[PDB]
Ligand binder design. Structure first.
Ligand SMILES: *[C@@H]1O[C@H](CO[C@@H]2O[C@@H](C)[C@@H](O)[C@@H](O)[C@@H]2O)[C@@H](O[C@@H]2O[C@H](CO)[C@@H](O[C@@H]3O[C@H](CO[C@H]4O[C@H](CO)[C@@H](O)[C@H](O)[C@@H]4O)[C@@H](O)[C@H](O[C@H]4O[C@H](CO)[C@@H](O)[C@H](O)[C@@H]4O)[C@H]3NC(C)=O)[C@H](O)[C@H]2NC(C)=O)[C@H](O)[C@H]1NC(C)=O
Ligand SMILES: *[C@@H]1O[C@H](CO[C@@H]2O[C@@H](C)[C@@H](O)[C@@H](O)[C@@H]2O)[C@@H](O[C@@H]2O[C@H](CO)[C@@H](O[C@@H]3O[C@H](CO[C@H]4O[C@H](CO)[C@@H](O)[C@H](O)[C@@H]4O)[C@@H](O)[C@H](O[C@H]4O[C@H](CO)[C@@H](O)[C@H](O)[C@@H]4O)[C@@H]3O)[C@H](O)[C@H]2NC(C)=O)[C@H](O)[C@H]1NC(C)=O
Ligand code: HEM
Ligand code: HEM
Ligand SMILES: *[C@@H]1O[C@H](CO)[C@@H](O[C@@H]2O[C@H](CO)[C@@H](O)[C@H](O)[C@H]2NC(C)=O)[C@H](O)[C@H]1NC(C)=O
Ligand SMILES: *[C@@H]1O[C@H](CO)[C@@H](O[C@@H]2O[C@H](CO)[C@@H](O)[C@H](O)[C@H]2NC(C)=O)[C@H](O)[C@H]1NC(C)=O
Ligand SMILES: *[C@@H]1O[C@H](CO)[C@@H](O[C@@H]2O[C@H](CO)[C@@H](O)[C@H](O)[C@H]2NC(C)=O)[C@H](O)[C@H]1NC(C)=O
Ligand SMILES: *[C@@H]1O[C@H](CO)[C@@H](O[C@@H]2O[C@H](CO)[C@@H](O)[C@H](O)[C@H]2NC(C)=O)[C@H](O)[C@H]1NC(C)=O
Ligand SMILES: [Ca+2]
Ligand SMILES: [Ca+2]
Lengths: 105, 466, 57, 105, 465, 58
């Protein structure tokens, strides 16, 4: 990494001089806790029929959505103390911070 | 197997199965599409799978400028030395720039209104066209860049294109930094968590890891609870704009045509400023426009964003709720009664226990958004811990943090302290009346609105280079 | 990979006889980095990628 | 991961039930700090001639050994209060803990 | 490309270059061989390179039993149902068992003597033969397993080979745990750091990561400073054994023959007990038997274990000294004067600054072993932090930790609390007089030596069904 | 991978006419896991890997 820098790289590289990939694009996320997969290392919970997580069936995500999340939308509560811009800036901010690629078909 | 049309579970596909008695999807043999996120080390039996961030973790306006050097070059107007970003060459918005159009192999925007033939936009991040409200914010920042570059050229005529571009970019980055940590995050976390997770800035620390943590990609989707089911558009009296002032969201995903042909970004921004967010409530988590009709105009089935969030966390190998509470130094409820105490809601505790069996298996997004909100914030203690912790690292671990000695002069710092998102809208649109105080709290017209003239501009005098 | 619509305006500047020579070399250099070396290469790449180049002669 | 068991696996697997590779053999080391490589991600300091580390030439390890470590063996100081078994048990214990494979020939 | 014979720097070779005015290697176009450690993700441009641990992190006596399932089967006696480990079938030690022989591609043990044609030993870890003192410790634990199994069968006649091996293994693991955390680590870290990094055990914690950290593979090489330049062997009166009582280490590496023929393990163990270790001193860090003549008997050139330590650090991408001090909550010296204050030595500080330029680039092992030692410990503050932190994770993060509820009964635990490395020698060797108290502090014959009869045995009464 | 020296003693138990048949099946099973199904396959593997099995033939 150049020992002299006026502006930032586009890739985020060289921000940290000791460890110059940290925060740069196209690297792995950092893990604050050891990961939790059905097979130890790869398979997501729910993958294999009949495999419990910590001794209990894995709940279908759409079931959890249906039973806990869904509500009658005409009964929605407006926030007296936050504008819609408060949600929108969050999305715009998320898009400065993280994008997790998926294969294409 | 194409994960978009197949319901077979074969790598790389992790489709959501349908429960019996689904209110929307009567066909149990159908599924909701899901591609597992790309592994860092594809194919390994030795490593523990992990996903990739394709962007810069830093708050550096990478969604404007790009996170890859080819793309960053392509976003630039390379026909002169003015240091500007490329602008649409086919359309304007009452004299003002639009984002250029991208050239995609499979362009979802073209599908939203087949007759208008308006493709998706090109920007620093690939998702700028997902909702016109997001596109309007991208369009705004692009315009602000070109304004700053113009003004810097006026002020420093000897400066070349590269110099202009870089100095304007450096300013736009600091503007995102300031809005985010001065105006936004305090209204996310609330004061208690803000003082705990984001104490007054001292200086850069080269030992602080500024990476995005896997869990953050899921926990920051808290904002899905704030989503309103319509896009609101308002005229220059802040009155509904006709014919269509309230468009259902399931008809605005990828709908770039609406920005180009239905009157530019001024009405969308007015809508944002003068319409409330949805409040997260324990019995009103997310709306049907994202839980039942997400992207229904551009795929074969409508998606369920909440359910996607929870499938994704499983895809990414995330620990469940109680592991994250332990991590944050919070009590970990075992029993349904204890979960009721932590949620201040015995009914919701029962509902979560009926699905999950133990609080240990609650998916982080679901547990996070279930927690009662902190005073004067809109997340609860667990999400405030995760989100606060992350944004601390992004500040303390960033060499080009705007307040760090040697990034700006003291004079330049004093100038930047004046910036505000309302002023930026004034400076880049046909809007002359904007939100007051914190744009993020101000929401009722006209009670919370002021004339632009009352607002001081960004003074670039300390950027003069003799 | 793909040619962008706003790059077509750069093809206009190259074919402008009265445009500045330094401006043209800055663009040639832009395109030369992307693997396109002549104005013919550039117009041919825009065609492949779906654009209409009929007003180039 | 059997929900019941009496003894340890040979591989160390399933020792932690939530994250069952943790402490198992033929898995990557955990990093307590971000790693520090010449090129950011792979190359060791000293790989490329003329590449400095944090602003200074990388010292040949054999130079460091020659200058700092070398001493006349006849000068060696016996430890009054530690036996030779105290060193040996360390090595035996090292071999309960870690072994970092390298290719052969 | 062959790292052993070429000095070319191309993957996977990272040879050590030779400075001008080397005391031993005159030729600057020579090198010291080094293979970079295997990457976790071969070939990747995206991941940050990391190395692999081929063993179980846990203190589970994996060096006896293996960390891979085929190897574990191969180490067992499958000709009976007595649950025993395989023993050498060609040679014996005054009637007692020896480790079986391995079948290697280029047995290095065979390149040591050649006449004796004695191959390398086979054990749970691959390094059983590196020095005969290590082999004697492997052989001891092998015999202790077979002792325990025999006695357990006798006590529980109904038990099959699986149950026997498993129950004996459980005990051998707990004995390694107890020696390690009761007798050894307190003499490595000292009282203050022991109380700080290893407070009294509470219970298992499923949320404590038990993985070995990269840095620990380098920092635990502190023990290279304790290595003496000879192997000492003693008779039944703890007197030098003739004709060769003090073998230079350059002639002991991989010398499996010396065990089979030059008198078995009894002499070597006596020597370990009654000979002092080397002391780490800032001007006497490591000796030339490992700094100039490591593996000379089996290689093209002799190696520099200290320099290997520092090359490995770099191969593994370990941060430098000051970064590890910040991690451990220790002050970070910037100037030569401040490094002098931390080392109590402005001379060593100057020498480290001449090589490294900043205290930030000092390699961890070098900075670690430079530090003045803790009271009644043999490492300094930095190394005590790294080592202490790791052994805590192996205790609290171990589901089968010997003290954890459900692993042993209260009666079984009471019995195990009496184990001692001294008794294990009494029980598995021909030796009748052994060290007392802490075997790791006792080091003078006869003052620090007791008779075996004076020592309590392990009561397997609580293991009856 | 390689045949081990101590496994030679297992070949002796198999060829002991007077030895226990359950003992022999335990060993057959041990070797069958390593991919070796007959006594011939076992002796012909040990020879490849450096040992002498002539002490079991003409
Ligand atoms: C620049 O930043 C670094 C990074 O620190 C982080 O910075 C911000 C992001 C903060 O908000 C916060 O998130 C965090 O502090 C600062 O360095 C850190 O400094 C602390 C304080 O010394 C240090 O904590 C100490 O760690 C050691 C080592 O073990 C730690 O790591 C392992 C990793 O797996 C864990 O298992 C372990 O639990 C622990 O986290 C630990 O021994 C210390 O705790 C012992 O000693 C304490 C008293 O000395 C005692 O209270 C405690 O009970 C233990 O006995 C722990 N100390 C404390 C007080 O927490 C970090 O390890 C260190 N990390 C890094 C990356 O360097 C740095 O100070 C800052 N510098 C400046 C100039 O501001
Ligand atoms: C089971 O063990 C768990 C792990 O224990 C560790 O290992 C053992 C062997 C011991 O060394 C032990 O002391 C170690 O902690 C243990 O869980 C741990 O508990 C601590 C304390 O609650 C958690 O620390 C808290 O972390 C949050 C989040 O920040 C952390 O992560 C970021 C990113 O990695 C880092 O930058 C931070 O430095 C932290 O490491 C902090 O917000 C929090 O501190 C804040 O709040 C406290 C309290 O008000 C203040 O005093 C601080 O100044 C801060 O304002 C803590 O640092 C830790 O995350 C957690 N780890 C795990 C694995 O979950 C658990 O309690 C043990 N259980 C029992 C009952 O034994
Ligand atoms: C108009 C508003 C929003 C959407 C439309 C929208 C949509 C998505 C989708 C489809 C994903 C991917 C889901 C999956 O697992 O397949 C997604 C992920 C993320 N969101 Fe969403 N979101 C909208 C709005 C918001 C708001 C207000 C957020 C927060 C303040 C927010 C956050 C996120 C984040 C951080 C992600 C993850 C990004 C990644 O790729 O890592 N979104 N959103
Ligand atoms: C007779 C005593 C010792 C040796 C002979 C010996 C040799 C080595 C060698 C060759 C290495 C590899 C160096 C490299 O980087 O290529 C090595 C590594 C490790 N040691 Fe050494 N060692 C002897 C003695 C000890 C003692 C007393 C130790 C501990 C107190 C000790 C530790 C270690 C450790 C932990 C390693 C790294 C192991 C790994 O592969 O992960 N050694 N030793
Ligand atoms: C690069 O900048 C120039 C100057 O701002 C842009 O040229 C203007 O383009 C608009 C829209 O086509 C025209 O109406 C103006 O007449 C042009 N002005 C001048 C001074 O020529 C140009 O479009 C920009 N290029 C890109 C790709 O954004
Ligand atoms: C899709 O796009 C077309 C434009 O191609 C929209 O048509 C315009 O609609 C407005 C408002 O109703 C009319 O005033 C214009 O005259 C229409 N233009 C043309 C040429 O048709 C159409 O409304 C869009 N949206 C929908 C709902 O299909
Ligand atoms: C497996 O265990 C048996 C029983 O202890 C061992 O058999 C003894 O072997 C020694 C050495 O060859 C003989 O002197 C004894 O007579 C044998 N005892 C009995 C009762 O058979 C056998 O050697 C062990 N096998 C391995 C590979 O270790
Ligand atoms: C190499 O091994 C041989 C084989 O044992 C050692 O030779 C024996 O040494 C003892 C002690 O001098 C003699 O009593 C034996 O008669 C020797 N055996 C035979 C058959 O030669 C030899 O000493 C070893 N080499 C060295 C240098 O020690
Ligand atoms: Ca960014
Ligand atoms: Ca082990």
């Amino acid at each position: 990494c150049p020992e002299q820098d006026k502006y930032r790289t586009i890739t985020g590289m060289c921000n940290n001089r000791r460890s110059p990939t940290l925060g740069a694009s196209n690297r792995a996320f950092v893990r604050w806790l050891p990961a939790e997969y059905e097979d130890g290392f790869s398979l997501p919970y729910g993958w294999t029929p009949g495999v419990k997580r910590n001794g209990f069936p894995v709940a279908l995500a759409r079931a959890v959505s249906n039973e806990i999340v869904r509500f009658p939308t005409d009964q929605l509560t407006p926030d007296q103390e936050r504008s819609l811009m408060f949600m929108q800036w969050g999305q715009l901010l998320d898009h400065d911070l993280d994008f997790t690629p998926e294969p294409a078909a | 197997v194409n994960c978009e049309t197949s319901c077979v579970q074969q790598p790389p596909c992790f489709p959501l199965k349908i429960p019996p008695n689904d209110p929307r999807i009567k066909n149990q043999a159908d599924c909701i599409p899901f591609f597992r996120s790309c592994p860092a080390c594809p194919g390994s039996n030795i490593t523990i799978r992990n996903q990739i961030n394709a962007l810069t973790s830093f708050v550096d306006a990478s969604m404007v400028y790009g996170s890859e050097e080819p793309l960053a070059r392509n976003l630039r107007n390379m026909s002169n030395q003015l240091g500007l970003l490329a602008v649409n060459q086919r359309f304007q918005d009452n004299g003002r720039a639009l984002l250029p159009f991208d050239n995609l192999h499979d362009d979802p925007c073209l599908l939203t209104n087949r007759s208008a033939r308006i493709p998706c936009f090109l920007a620093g991040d690939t998702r700028s066209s997902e909702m016109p409200e997001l596109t309007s914010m991208h369009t705004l920042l692009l315009r602000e860049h070109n304004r700053l570059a113009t003004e810097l050229k006026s002020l420093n005529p000897r400066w070349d294109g590269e110099r202009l571009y870089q100095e304007a970019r450096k300013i736009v980055g600091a503007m995102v930094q300031i809005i985010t940590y001065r105006d936004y995050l305090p209204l996310v976390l609330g004061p208690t968590a803000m003082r705990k997770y984001l104490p007054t800035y001292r200086s850069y620390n080269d030992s602080v890891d500024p990476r995005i943590a896997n869990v953050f990609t899921n926990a920051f989707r808290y904002g899905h609870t704030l989503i309103q089911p319509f896009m609101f558009r308002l005229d220059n009296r802040y009155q509904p704009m006709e014919p269509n002032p309230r468009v259902p969201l399931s008809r605005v995903f990828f709908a770039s045509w609406r920005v180009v042909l239905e009157g530019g970004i001024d009405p969308i921004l007015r809508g944002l400023m003068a319409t409330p967010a949805k409040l997260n409530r324990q019995n009103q988590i997310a709306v049907d426009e994202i839980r039942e009709r997400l992207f229904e105009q551009v795929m074969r089935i409508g998606l369920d964003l909440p359910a996607l969030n929870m499938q994704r966390s499983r895809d990414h190998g995330l620990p469940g709720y109680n592991a994250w509470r332990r991590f944050c130094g919070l009590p970990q409820p075992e029993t349904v009664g204890q979960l009721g105490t932590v949620l201040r809601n015995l009914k919701l505790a029962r509902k979560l226990m009926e699905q999950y069996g133990t609080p240990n298996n609650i998916d982080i997004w679901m547990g996070g958004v279930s927690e009662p909100l902190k005073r004067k914030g809109r997340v609860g203690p667990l999400l405030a811990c995760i989100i606060g912790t992350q944004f601390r690292k992004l500040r303390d671990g960033d060499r080009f943090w705007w307040e760090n000695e040697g990034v700006f002069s003291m004079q330049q710092r004093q100038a930047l302290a004046q910036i505000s998102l309302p002023r930026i809208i004034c400076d880049n649109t046909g809007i002359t009346t904007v939100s007051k105080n914190n744009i993020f709290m101000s929401n009722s017209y006209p009670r919370d609105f002021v004339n632009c003239s009352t607002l001081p501009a960004l003074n670039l005098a300390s950027w003069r280079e003799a | 990979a793909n040619f962008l619509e706003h790059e077509l305006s750069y093809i206009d500047v190259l074919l402008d006889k009265n445009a500045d020579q330094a401006t043209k070399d800055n663009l040639r250099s832009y395109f030369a980095d992307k693997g396109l070396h002549s104005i013919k290469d550039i117009i041919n790449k825009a065609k492949q990628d779906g654009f209409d180049v009929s007003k180039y002669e």
